[PDB]
Amino acid sequence: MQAIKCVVVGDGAVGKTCLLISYTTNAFPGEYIPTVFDNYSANVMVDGKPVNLGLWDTAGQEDYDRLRPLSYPQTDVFLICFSLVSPASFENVRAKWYPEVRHHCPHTPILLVGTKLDLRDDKDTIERLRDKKLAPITYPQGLAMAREIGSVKYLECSALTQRGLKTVFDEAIRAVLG
């Protein structure tokens, strides 16, 4: 069976684990349990042939900066993730995640993924940001960041509602296999 290795990175609290678990199991995690290192496996049929997805969940915490690259060798595609309702997490795409991944994996495709899409239209979330003169990250703004960091694709999704979720992994697959 063809196999694809996909590694997911990005700031603490952005939704990396929920993204992977909602996609692979259709169940959205009830708890917020920060990750150290987890690997999941799932199969998909791609144009009539099965592909094994090896999905590598990593820690957003800076504590794990020396450990994290244990995941990187032989990666086929990265998902760099930020929350659409956390401008700090968005900035770190450029400041931290892109340069980290590229150092270890000079040629590996990167998808930029904006998470928590359901909160961009959430009134309380909008107000919480508006109180501080901020707004959610917009699709054109995310795309501009994707271009700046040389992502092969920019995608937005909600692990919670599953809107855009399948497409994130579809595009990750196509980024590797065509």
Binding site: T25, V36, N39, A42, V44, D170
Partner: peptide, 24 residues
């Protein structure tokens, strides 16, 4: 086209126990 995923397995779990200072 690409199908929905199947056959979920949680293959590796690494924890950290802050009291013992060790990975679980």
């Amino acid at each position: 086209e690409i199908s929905l995923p199947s056959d979920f397995e949680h293959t590796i779990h690494v924890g950290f126990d802050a009291v013992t200072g060790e990975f679980t």
